[PDB]
Amino acid sequence: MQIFVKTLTGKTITLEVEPSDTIENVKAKIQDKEGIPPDQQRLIFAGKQLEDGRTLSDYNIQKESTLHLVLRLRGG
Amino acid sequence: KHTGYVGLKNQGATCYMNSLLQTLFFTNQLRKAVYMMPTEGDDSSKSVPLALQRVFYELQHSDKPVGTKKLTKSFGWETLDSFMQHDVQELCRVLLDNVENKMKGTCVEGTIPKLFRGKMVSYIQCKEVDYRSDRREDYYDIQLSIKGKKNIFESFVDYVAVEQLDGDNKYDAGEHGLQEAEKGVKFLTLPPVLHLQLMRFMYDPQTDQNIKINDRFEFPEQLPLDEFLQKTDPKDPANYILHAVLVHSGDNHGGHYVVYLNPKGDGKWCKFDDDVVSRCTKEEAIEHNYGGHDDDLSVRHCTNAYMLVYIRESKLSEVLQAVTDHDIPQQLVERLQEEKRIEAQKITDFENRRSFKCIWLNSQFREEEITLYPDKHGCVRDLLEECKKAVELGEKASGKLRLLEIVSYKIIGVHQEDELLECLSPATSRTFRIEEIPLDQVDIDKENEMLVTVAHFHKEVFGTFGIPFLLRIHQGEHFREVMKRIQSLLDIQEKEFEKFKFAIVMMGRHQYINEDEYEVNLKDFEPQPGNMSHPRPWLGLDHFNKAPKRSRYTYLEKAIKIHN
Numbered sequence: 001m002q003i004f005v006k007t008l009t010g011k012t013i014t015l016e017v018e019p020s021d022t023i024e025n026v027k028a029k030i031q032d033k034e035g036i037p038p039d040q041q042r043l044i045f046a047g048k049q050l051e052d053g054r055t056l057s058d059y060n061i062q063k064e065s066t067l068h069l070v071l072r073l074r075g076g
Numbered sequence: 077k078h079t080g081y082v083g084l085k086n087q088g089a090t091c092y093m094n095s096l097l098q099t100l101f102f103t104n105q106l107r108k109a110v111y112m113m114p115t116e117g118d119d120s121s122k123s124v125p126l127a128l129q130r131v132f133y134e135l136q137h138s139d140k141p142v143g144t145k146k147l148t149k150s151f152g153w154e155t156l157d158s159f160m161q162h163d164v165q166e167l168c169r170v171l172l173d174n175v176e177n178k179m180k181g182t183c184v185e186g187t188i189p190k191l192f193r194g195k196m197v198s199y200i201q202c203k204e205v206d207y208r209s210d211r212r213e214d215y216y217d218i219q220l221s222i223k224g225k226k227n228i229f230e231s232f233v234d235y236v237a238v239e240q241l242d243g244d245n246k247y248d249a250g251e252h253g254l255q256e257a258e259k260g261v262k263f264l265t266l267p268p269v270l271h272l273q274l275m276r277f278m279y280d281p282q283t284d285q286n287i288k289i290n291d292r293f294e295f296p297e298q299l300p301l302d303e304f305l306q307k308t309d310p311k312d313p314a315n316y317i318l319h320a321v322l323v324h325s326g327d328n329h330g331g332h333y334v335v336y337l338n339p340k341g342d343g344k345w346c347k348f349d350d351d352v353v354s355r356c357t358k359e360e361a362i363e364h365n366y367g368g369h370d371d372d373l374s375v376r377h378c379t380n381a382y383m384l385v386y387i388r389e390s391k392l393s394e395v396l397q398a399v400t401d402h403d404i405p406q407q408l409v410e411r412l413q414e415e416k417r418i419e420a421q422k423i424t425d426f427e428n429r430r431s432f433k434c435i436w437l438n439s440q441f442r443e444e445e446i447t448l449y450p451d452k453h454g455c456v457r458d459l460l461e462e463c464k465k466a467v468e469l470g471e472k473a474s475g476k477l478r479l480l481e482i483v484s485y486k487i488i489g490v491h492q493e494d495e496l497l498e499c500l501s502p503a504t505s506r507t508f509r510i511e512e513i514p515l516d517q518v519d520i521d522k523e524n525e526m527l528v529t530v531a532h533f534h535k536e537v538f539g540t541f542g543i544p545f546l547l548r549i550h551q552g553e554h555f556r557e558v559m560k561r562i563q564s565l566l567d568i569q570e571k572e573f574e575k576f577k578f579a580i581v582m583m584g585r586h587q588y589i590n591e592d593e594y595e596v597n598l599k600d601f602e603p604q605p606g607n608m609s610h611p612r613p614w615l616g617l618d619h620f621n622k623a624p625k626r627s628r629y630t631y632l633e634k635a636i637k638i639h640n
Contacts, residue, residue, distance in 0.1 A: 002248035004198075004259070008278055010221035010234060012259050014245045033244075035279065040286060042166060047193065047216025049169040063248075064211045066198055068219050071277050071286055073324045073382055075333040076089025076161035 001063040003056075005043070007034060008069060019057040023050050030069065044068040077139060078499075081339065083351040084135070085143045085428065085453070091350055092164040093144060095335040096171070098348045099320050099385060101135050102339040103269060105395050108403050109187040113179065116407055120415075124150050124171075125178055133412055136399065140496065141351035141453050161330055164322055165217065165273045165383055172216065191395070192216045194265040197306065200247060203256045207249045212264070217271040223278060227294035228384075232304050236261055262306040266314045268391040270299075272384040277328060288328050290378050292368030295321075297358075299386050312390055317341065320385035323365050326378050333382075336361035341387070341396045351453065352498075428452060432459060432497075437511035439470045441565060443543065446510075450497060457493040463510050474518055480509045485540040486614065487529045516548050524551035528601050529614040530562070534621065537579070537586045541621050549601070554594035562617070577618035583611060 001019070004012050015029050027038040043050045045059055045067050061067070084094040100106055115126035127150040134142040148158055176188040193214055200209040220231040238260045241247045247257035272295075280287040301314035321336040335348045336356070345361045347354050367380025387395050401409070429449045436446040448466060450459045460477045469475065479491040483505045491500070500508070517527055528549055532542035545565065549558060555578075563573055579588045580600055589595070601613055 006219070008275065009223075010275070012239050012241065012245065014241070014248070016248075036286075042163075044169060044217070044219075046214040047169065048173045049166065064198070064200070064209055066211070066213060070165070070219055070273065070275070072163040072166060072329060073276060073288060073326075073331065074161035074163055074329040075092050075324055075326060075331040076159070 003061060004064065004066040005030060006066060006068050008036075008071065012066070017056060019061075020055055022055050023052050026050075026056065026067075034069075036069070036071070040071045042070050042072065044070060077353060079346050079353050079355050081346075081353055082135065082139055083141045083348055083353045084131075085141050085145075086350040087143075087145065087148065088159040089161050090144060090148070090158060091333040092162050092167055093147070094350050095322055095333045095348065096164050096167055097131060097135075097144065097147075098335050098337065099322065099383075101132060102320070102337055103191070103395065104397050104399055106187065106191060107132050108397070108399060109179075109184040110175070111404050111408065112182075112184050114182055116411075120146060120150075122150060122152075124174060126150070128175070129408055130412055133404070133408065136404075164324075164333055165271075168271065168383075169216070191269050192267050192271065194263070194267045197262050197264055199260045199262070200241070201258050201260075202247065202249060202252070203258060205249065205252045205255055207252060207255065209247075209249075216267075217273050219273050219275050222275050222293050223289055223291060225293065228272075228296060228299065231293075232301070236263070236304050263301075263304050264306055266301055266305070266316075266388070268388050268395055269319075270316055270384075270386040270388075272386070274382055274384070276324070276380065276382060286328055288324075288326075288378060290368055290370070290380055292366050293380070294366045295362070295381065295384055297362060315389040316386035317389060317392060318362070318384065319387045320383075321361050321365055321381050322383035322385075323379065324382040325375055331378070336365070339396075341392050426451075430497075432508075434508040434510060436463065436467060437509055437543075438468075439473065439512065441543075441545075441567070443509075452497065454497055455493070456491050456495045456497065456500075459497060460493065460510060470512065474513045474515060476518065477510050477512050480511065480546075482507045482509055482544060484538075485542065485544060486531045487544040487546065488611075490546075514548075517546065520548060524598075525549065526598055526601065529612065530617065531614060532617045532619070532621070535618060537581050537584065537616060540616075541623065547615070549596055549598070551596070551598055553596040555589070555591060555596055556594060558596060559591070572619065575619050579616045579618065580613060581616045582613040586616065 001017060003015050003017055005015055007013055013033060015026065015033070017026060017029065023043065024038065026043070027041050030036060030041060031038055045061060045065065048059070050059060050067070084097060086094065110125065110128050110132060113125040113129065115123050115129060118126050120126060127147045131142060131144060131147055172188055172192065179185050179187060193216060196213055196215060198211040198213065202208070218235070220228065221234055222231065225231040225234060238258055241257040241259050246254035249255045274293060276289045277286055278289055295318070297318050299316035299318070301316060302308045305314060319338065319341070323334045323336065325332045325334070336345055337348060338345045343358060345356050345358055347356045347360070365381035367376070369376050430452040431447055432450055433445070433447045436444045438444060446463070446466065448459060448462050450462050456479055460479060463477060480487050481489050481491060481501070520527065525548055527546050529544060530547045531540050531544040533540045547558070547562065547565075577588060578591065579586045601615070603610055603612060
C-alpha cells in the first residue's frame, strides 16, 4: 500500500509500504528516499507521534494516509 | 509575586517541560479537567495524571517556584533523563496522547480532542484519468512551512496550496497503476485551541547536516482563518487570538526554551523563564520573536518563536474560565497537603543555590566582606540564619540579625525576615549588610522611641561616606545624651568629635540642629502627611574623613589653548 509523507519542504512524497511494517522500517524507507537519518526523524499521524517498535496497523494507517515528518529543536 | 503567578524549578535541562507545562496550565478548561481525574488509589511514583495534578495545584496555590521533581519520576525517568535536552512539541505530542488515553474510562473522557482535535481533507485528482480519491484525517497541530514565506498568511496559503504528485511520487490509483496526480488539502475543523509548529529546520547540503532556520517569520496578533476552511461560517468566523509564544534560543539539538503568555486573554503579557515570571510588553512577545536578525551577532540570532498557541475568539471564555478552589476536589487538596507533612522529618544533596555577596558588620562595629550560599528560592530569614553559622556570634548578645539595603552610603530601609530572596534588588547601586541588632533596639518602645538612620556626609548633603548605622532616639531626650550614644558607637579620637555637625535632611534640603538646645522631638523625623515610599528624613553627621585613593591620570593632561 502507498502512503504519503509531508516532508520538511512541505512537499508530499509517496512510500510503498505494508501494514506489517514497523516504524523503523518506514523511517528506513524515508531515509532511502529523502536522506534524513532515522535518528532525527519524527512522524506524526492524527496528533499521535508514531512510536518505534510498533507497526502501521497498530495506528490504523492505510492506503493514502498522510504522515507528517518533523525534526527537533532541542533545549534544556 | 510581581505578576500574580509563579514559575517552575529547573532540574538541569527541563526548560522545554517547564515551558510546555506553563502553556497547559493556563489552558484553564484543560486544568479543570485534569483536576477531575481519578487518582485516589494511584501510586505517586507511577501516576502521570496525579503528578500533573500536583504541579497544577502548586502553580495555583504556592508563591515560591514549583518543583517538577515527581513529574519526571512518574514518566519512568531516572535522573539521567533530567539533563536531556528535548523538543517541546515532541513532548507535547507524547504527553497529550498519554493523558488522553488515561482519561479514557473516566468522567472527563474526550477532553483533549474537544479542545485540540481538528479534521482535514486530502483531495486527490488524477490528471490523465477519471480517478478522484478522498481522505479525511484528524490532527492536533499544524506544521507550517517557514522558509521563503513572509508571515503566517503565506504559510497557510502554501499549506492548502495544490501540490503536484509527479515523477517518482506518482499516485497509486491501483487500477490505472501509477498516475500523475494533484494533491490538495483543506481544513474542515479548527479546534478551540490551535497549536502551530513553525518548521524551523532544513537540511543544509553545504555542511551535510540539519540546521535551524533563523530567518524572519511574522505571526499576527489576530488570526483570520475562514480563508482556509472548505466551508465557511457567517455566524462563527474562525478568528483567533494569540495566547502563547514558545521561544527557542540556540542550536538544532541544544539551546534553551522560554514561553510568553497573556494568561488572562486580555493583552497583558508576561515572560516565563523557568523559575522566573516577569511582566513584559506585547512587542517583546510578538515582534521580537519574528527573529531572523542576523546582525550584531549574539544570542538574538538563533532566538525566535517555535510554537504558537491561538484561541478561537468565540471560545475565549470557556477555555479561560476562572479556577477557584471550588473547582478542586477535596481528596486532592488533602492528598497533597497531608503529603507535605511527611517531610518535616528528614546534611546532603542541596541544591540549586546561589552565591550572595554582602557586608557583615561585626560586634566591634567594623566591616567584613562575606559571601553566603542560600536557597535561590529561600527567604531573608534563611540568609540571616545562614550567616549565623558562618561567623562569630558574639560571646553573648541579641543573637538576632537584620538585613539592610544601602545605596550611596545611606541606609534606605530594613528588610523584613519574610521577604523572598528573589525579590531583592540586583542593581549595582544596592549593597546589603547583615548586622546584629543592638540590645536597645530589639524590643523598642513605640510611643516615645524610634530607630532612625544615621549617615556621614561632608559639607554637602549628597557627599556621603563612611558607615551608616541605626540609632535609637528617645522622646524629649536632651540631645547631649544622643551625642553620648553616637560617640560610643564610632570610637575614634576625642579630638575629631567636637568638629562634628548634626543636621536633619529631607529631599536635598537640610536644617542644622542646635547641639545646646537639647530639642529631641520625634515629629522632626517624620515624613510629609501621606508619604512613606518617599525618602524618610534622616540624621546627618558632618565632618572629615579617612578614605582610599586612586591613581594619577596623565599620559598628556591638562589645559586647553588656541595659540593663534
